[PDB]
Amino acid sequence: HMKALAKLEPGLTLTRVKKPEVGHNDVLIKIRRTAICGTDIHIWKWDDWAQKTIPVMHVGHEYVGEIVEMGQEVRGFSIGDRVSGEGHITCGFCRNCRAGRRHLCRNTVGVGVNREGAFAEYLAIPAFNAFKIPPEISDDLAAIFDPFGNATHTALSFNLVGEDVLITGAGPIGVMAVAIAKHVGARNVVITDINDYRLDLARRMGATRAVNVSRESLRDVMADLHMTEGFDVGLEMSGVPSAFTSLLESMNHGGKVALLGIPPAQTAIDWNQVIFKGLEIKGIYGREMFETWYKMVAMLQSGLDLSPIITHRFAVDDYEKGFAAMLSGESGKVILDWA
């Protein structure tokens, strides 16, 4: 049996459950660190989709661990390799899985959502959903590779060299996009939100301005920076309609927009912004490919500093405090330690 954080009955209980089975193509991962994700607080809340999807089962899916066992068909891994992995495990043999487009596999299950999650001592997943972490990258950073991949997918969508970048949303992914943008040559990087704590973190991660748009005018900020013509690149991270609206209004002619945050169903936009300015809008799908993760590793190996994004660390026994910190909204990523 193994210790785990489960939805036994809101909240999560520190339960105890049997270890997972290892198929012919599975790796067995002994978990070292797990981050608390935005999906996780929905489960903790026993909220909308939480009451509709969780089997009731331990949750979680942002993790790093060391391989302790593998099936007899697993290729390319040693016992002892440190790995992180994706949030959704796929079939691995369909045409789409075989070509790396596992976001297209017709049989995806969510780790910690549809099946056993990473909030347990041991995690079994298919080898093709695992990603080896090199020893120069810490466990805490490895544990957030999945949201880092979304930030990278969004922020590297366009060339940023000497470009002015607007980011709407200072959640963890938006804050990582700030640091990426400066790393890859952006000029002005302006991020907006309504949370002073999250924006202060963004400033510490290199934002030119971190603008609380309920306290300060984005237009004023642009005039302060001598860029009244508008931004070259906009990364929409929040999914909030007013943020999207303000981002489109703030783009210059020929501006490029990456859409990561998911708008509500009846979101109307001013398509005159898109057409008259010739904007390019690119949807950033949720489940990035491992080619993104290889660029992630390379950036970390080049001195990209993501460390400020980790604001709280707790032992797994003290998981209650980690969800509290996440809930306040005054946190970056929160790490649970399983040592």
Place this chain on the structure above:
Amino acid sequence: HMKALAKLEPGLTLTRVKKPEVGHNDVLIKIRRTAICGTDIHIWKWDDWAQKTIPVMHVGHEYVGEIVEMGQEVRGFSIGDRVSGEGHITCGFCRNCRAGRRHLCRNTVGVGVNREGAFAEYLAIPAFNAFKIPPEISDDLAAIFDPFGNATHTALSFNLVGEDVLITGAGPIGVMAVAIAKHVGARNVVITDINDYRLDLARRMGATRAVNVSRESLRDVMADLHMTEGFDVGLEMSGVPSAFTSLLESMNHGGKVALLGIPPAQTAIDWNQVIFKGLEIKGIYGREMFETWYKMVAMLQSGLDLSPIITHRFAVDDYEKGFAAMLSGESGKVILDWA
């Protein structure tokens, strides 16, 4: 004095007006052919914007003619050169005009809208808004260079080689985009509308299928062509919300969308189509640059056949019949002759 087609009092009267003045940087064009544009029928109707903007003045802006006079500062033109030209004349000396982005000039006037138009024996415009037509291109084709430029701007936005292309809207610009798409290597080219006449013209210009979506199911058509995965490229020409909705639903993963038609203000779209499929959406601004027109000439010189797009020709005295044909909706482009 010169003969002209004016809004003297709905409809347009064959009036008689003084010739235009020639500034230092103007060319004076003796008009040969003029096409009836979608803006023109709005003026003929005395409709929404027509009652709000026309000075009451001769209208029109799709033209070809021969230069008969020029100002003393005009460069690069001979008396006798055949020219077409853009729908909006600009200042020509601002930073944006000097770099060819006259769609960005802060002082643009609409030919036949804000100022004297092309429905007259003589037309004066700034030399930098004129474009020389080579002798191997007929006058009738030259007269439609402006909508042809919009079709080219839209259809060449993406690489089409071996790609399946969906075009929504079989107006003249959509029909020209069909012929362009096949010329530049597209595989399946499917166009939709609700007008059987316009679709039949599209079929004659090379459409794989021309689908009346009130009589026939686009989904059925795609299953007939073994492309259930969806289209690679979608060109939205109509501005109709249901057409836009159906186009987004019909794109495959990684699909590319060019947005030429202008949606109504409160158009909501399903952004899940954009994000989950990773679609790329590009706004096609109304006033394309002359780099587009040079590609247009090159395609015509390579055997692109636009001739079927001209469905009616009338003398200028018989202009009443030309507006009648345009109004029925059973026409391609309609040419008025001024010889």
